[PDB]
Amino acid sequence: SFAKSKMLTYVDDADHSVIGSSATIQMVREVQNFYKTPEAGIKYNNQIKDR
């Protein structure tokens, strides 16, 4: 699983002059097929907000 915190560890690490950092992540699943969803359909395994 991916952790925005555990990634944030190393971005903290890089300088030692960085006083803070933060970010807003969006998962990206690029889709090969538009016209038809894969009949099964994609899933992120992770629920998302509405709209």
Next chain:
Amino acid sequence: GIEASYKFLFKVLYNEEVEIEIESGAGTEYDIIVQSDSLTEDLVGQTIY
């Protein structure tokens, strides 16, 4: 369980020629051009006719 197992198997066993058919087989290459629309691609590996 390899393919070659099968063919070899009688060579020792039956010392006679056998062939066993998988669709993929040795022959691989393709010429036509398909027009479809957003097919699931799960059919990759799955034959059509």
